[PDB]
Design a protein around this ligand. Structure first.
Ligand code: HEM
Ligand code: HEM
Ligand SMILES: OC[C@H]1O[C@@](CO)(O[C@H]2O[C@H](CO)[C@@H](O)[C@H](O)[C@H]2O)[C@@H](O)[C@@H]1O
Lengths: 99, 112, 55, 74, 50
């Protein structure tokens, strides 16, 4: 845990084996979170140095930054690797991990 | 190194937000910027790999011994763990040629 | 119903036959369900995807 | 090939309802900007934000984009 | 509870596995693993999966 928090500014990235069942919303939440990071938080919201704004996250302030960007991966089957396509794909994979 | 690269100048504004969204989480590029998950990047284009003072580096990063120039940074940013096997840098890479060009442009400016 | 009489003739079905029928029903019912289920999910199953991935 | 979702959100920010919602959020953003410039802001502890207006916009977009997005993906 | 604290409600997308008779899309599972390995694995574990 110590090494993990050190590599993430004190935050601990949870194990994802049950993430789909461990959160209200299931797949819809995971997908919405992964593809729901705006370019900037709403007006008036002060963001804690080291935080990222995501409306789907309770509080709005999450330690994980957006990581999915268009074509950062090259699918083996030639599928266009867009952010939402990748979000859809991992969420599906994470649902299988959980169930 | 050359003969497998192709850095060309680009947009410093396009790269300024590209750094903000995909790099500043773990890095600070300003002179007098503290170290975070990753080392401070100011003046990085001069020195060798793994030399920022006060930052615990990976042996693979120090043992990479590379003079950070535009072409090397470009090859690195394409696929970090391919260029430096064992680096603790969590980043898949800027796969589009123009993306890294625009980022390195901004970087070179804020670096010096 | 004469359909019933021709097989059991006013008698209720006996246990042995009931049990015997249960065994036939399990096999036949399972096959039919798996068959329907797999077909409804054509293209999604791993065996279908394995055929696609050939390179 | 551009992101199907950001593509849908753009289309729907352009409908009557969409344009109206970003307008409402925009008016709030401006009202907030002017408050931040004024002296004494730092100590008011009752500052206005635009999460509500942003949520109304986002909810509209979600309602329209949610049932359409997966048809645009493999 | 304020909207911010609650967090925005997640909309209902058409997952091909939503429905009493639907299996998962295995091609999507396979593609998902790749995204996990190349993008998430660096920070997230999957400890209960053999
Ligand atoms: C495209 C955006 C990025 C740029 C331009 C960048 C650049 C660099 C460079 C040049 C180094 C080597 C520094 C040296 O030789 O002294 C490095 C190291 C490192 N970076 Fe990044 N980086 C980026 C994004 C990230 C991200 C997103 C993170 C945090 C999740 C990260 C974490 C690290 C860490 C931990 C190291 C140390 C590597 C090691 O010791 O193995 N970087 N980065
Ligand atoms: C597409 C790959 C990824 C997936 C599927 C993913 C998924 C998730 C999910 C579902 C959560 C749970 C948030 C909650 O509590 O509801 C989370 C949290 C977190 N993730 Fe990731 N993540 C990915 C990549 C990354 C990367 C690359 C890093 C490390 C730089 C990272 C760092 C974190 C951290 C630190 C948290 C803590 C959030 C908090 O409690 O504020 N994630 N992630
Ligand atoms: O970790 C990302 C880092 O970005 C900052 C820069 O000020 O926040 C802005 O950029 C983020 C990434 O694009 C957004 O998620 C965030 O909402 C935005 O304010 C830092 O606050 C944050 O640590």
């Amino acid at each position: 845990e110590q090494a993990a928090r050190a590599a993430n500014q004190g935050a601990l990235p949870p194990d994802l084996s049950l993430i789909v069942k461990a959160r209200h919303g299931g797949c819809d939440y995971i997908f919405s979170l992964l593809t729901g990071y705006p370019d900037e938080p709403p007006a008036g919201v002060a963001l804690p140095p080291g935080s990222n704004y995501n409306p789907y996250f309770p509080g709005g302030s999450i330690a994980m930054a957006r990581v999915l960007f268009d074509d950062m991966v090259e699918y083996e089957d030639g599928t266009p690797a867009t952010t939402s396509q990748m979000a859809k794909d991992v969420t599906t994979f994470l649902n299988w991990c959980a169930e | 190194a050359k003969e497998s690269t192709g850095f060309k100048p680009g947009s410093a504004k396009k790269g300024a937000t590209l750094f903000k969204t995909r790099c500043q989480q773990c890095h600070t590029i300003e002179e007098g910027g503290p170290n975070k998950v990753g080392p401070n990047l100011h003046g990085i284009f001069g020195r060798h790999s793994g030399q920022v003072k006060g930052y615990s580096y990976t042996d693979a990063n120090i043992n990479k011994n590379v003079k950070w120039d535009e072409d090397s940074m470009s090859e690195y940013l394409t696929n970090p763990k391919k260029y430096i096997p064992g680096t603790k840098m969590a980043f898949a890479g800027l796969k589009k040629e123009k993306d890294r060009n625009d980022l390195i442009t901004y970087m070179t400016k804020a670096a010096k | 119903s004469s359909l019933y009489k021709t097989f059991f003739k006013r008698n209720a079905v006996f246990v042995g036959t009931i049990f015997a029928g249960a065994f036939v029903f399990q096999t036949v019912f399972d096959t039919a369900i798996t068959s329907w289920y797999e077909n409804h999910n054509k293209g999604k199953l791993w065996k279908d995807v394995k055929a696609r991935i050939a390179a | 090939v551009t992101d199907q979702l950001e593509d849908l959100r753009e289309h729907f920010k352009n409908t009557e309802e969409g344009k109206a919602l970003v307008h409402h959020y925009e008016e709030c953003a401006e009202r907030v900007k002017i408050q931040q410039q004024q002296p004494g802001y730092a100590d008011l502890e009752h500052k206005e934000d635009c999460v509500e207006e942003f949520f109304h916009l986002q909810h509209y977009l979600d309602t329209a984009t949610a049932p359409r997005l997966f048809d645009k993906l493999k | 509870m304020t909207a911010a604290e609650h967090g925005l409600h997640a909309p209902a997308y058409a997952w091909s596995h939503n429905g009493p008779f639907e299996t998962f899309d295995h091609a999507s599972i396979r593609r998902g693993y790749q995204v996990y390995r190349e993008v998430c694995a660096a920070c997230h574990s999957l400890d209960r999966v053999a």
